[PDB]
Amino acid sequence: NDYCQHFVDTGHRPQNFIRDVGLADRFEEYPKLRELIRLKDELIAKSNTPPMYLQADIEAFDIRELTPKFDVILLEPPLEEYYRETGEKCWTWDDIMKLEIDEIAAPRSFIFLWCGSGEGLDLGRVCLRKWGYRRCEDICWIKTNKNNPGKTDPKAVFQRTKEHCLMGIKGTVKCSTDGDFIHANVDIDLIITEEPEIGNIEKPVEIFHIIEHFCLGRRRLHLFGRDSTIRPGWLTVGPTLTNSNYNAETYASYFSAPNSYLTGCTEEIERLRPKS
């Protein structure tokens, strides 16, 4: 059985045949895996800030106006690559590189940069370097075409059926020592969903779950998010937001005394989560 040959013959991508990829059905038969995720999501929910959002044209925005520093940063710049190849501001990798992400990242922190599937896999790495991160994982969004079998960049040799979200690390983190900053190995580096309609530019909501499970820092920035992506636990900044409630003093107060910028952890999650 060769799913590559099967794709050549029928247009059903090999990823169409992976089973139980949804958020719910993956651990249906694995109660104790499901329980870890349930408890961790509850911990996230118990400690989440209310949604906060700022309309801003990021190309002409002094990013230093965003405070305090962020434990995790999720970027989704609309790639001029995409709109050129398919037909708000669109961003070249030179435009993206110019962002001063290093000025708002916490000294120990992580970045999650959506890079598409062409030149961004190389130039996104250059951006990580410029902002002071080391590439440490690559989360691949694998798109099925179960509803629309068949074929679909002039330099490409293969049909491109995924997007890469590069993950970078800043500072010194030690998985065994720094159990108060990260819960490693709770999620895998793959997201599998059906191809969205042409022009639907949303990224899969699971990327939020992976980030929230992994890093216990509560200061979470989503650059280039939209009305449709606002989320408790996150500050959303982007040009298309139809309102703004961000106040830097109010946002910062959620993490300063008596609060912590970290979620902490329960004794039950400590007993259930993967550890050396």
């Binding site: 050549v8 090999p14 992976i18 440490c136 074929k151 293969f158 491109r160 995924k162 190995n185 895998i188």
Partner: protein, 201 residues
């Protein structure tokens, strides 16, 4: 041509006797800066591999992991290639499911292996876009890459000669010459390669 192979050390074999190939594939034992149950090649040894004489126009398939996501990009550019695609092998279990548990990466768990796709020069007679850049396959062998890649490469470049570096016995294929230090002796059939092999050794 039926399968051919040379048991050898890749660092030391005079690969100029082998001619030119439309496709080069390597799954090397990268030094990923961790303790491993197999021997690795240093970064310098990898950079100095004489890949550039193997090819004038055609493709390179370079499997990468860990810090070799970046070192492999450096080697690809050093060897005169432009990276033009990136294939991932998504590993499934016997029931077509992702194995999500364990501790299989440093930060997140790992569900895939990556293969950089490079192009050199100006290749002729290849078939673009027949296959997808996602392979889905169970772990079958002691190899860390799926057998499906051979069919993808054939459909991409039918009937051309190809070379595999760091191959194992179960990797030998028609149209391929397989190099590696665990193959069974030397088995060459192409008349021009045997000629130069006699002259060189």
């Amino acid at each position: 041509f039926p399968p051919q192979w040379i048991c050898c050390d890749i660092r030391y074999l005079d690969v100029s006797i082998l001619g030119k190939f439309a496709v080069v594939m390597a799954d090397p034992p990268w030094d990923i800066h961790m303790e491993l149950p197999y021997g690795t090649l240093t970064d310098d040894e990898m950079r100095r591999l004489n890949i550039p004489v193997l090819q004038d126009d055609g493709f390179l398939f370079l499997w990468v992991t860990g810090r070799a996501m970046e070192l492999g990009r450096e080697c690809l550019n050093l060897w005169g290639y432009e990276r033009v695609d990136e294939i991932i092998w998504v590993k499934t279990n016997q029931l077509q499911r992702i194995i999500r548990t364990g501790r299989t990466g440093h930060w997140l768990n790992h569900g895939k292996e990556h293969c950089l796709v490079g192009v050199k020069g100006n290749p002729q007679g290849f078939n673009q876009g027949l296959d997808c850049d996602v392979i889905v396959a169970e772990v079958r062998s002691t190899s860390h890459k799926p057998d499906e890649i051979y069919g993808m490469i054939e459909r991409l470049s039918p009937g051309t000669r190809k070379i595999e570096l760091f191959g194992r016995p179960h990797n030998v294929q028609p149209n391929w010459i397989t190099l590696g230090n665990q193959l069974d002796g030397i088995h060459l059939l192409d008349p021009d390669v045997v000629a130069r092999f006699k002259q060189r050794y």
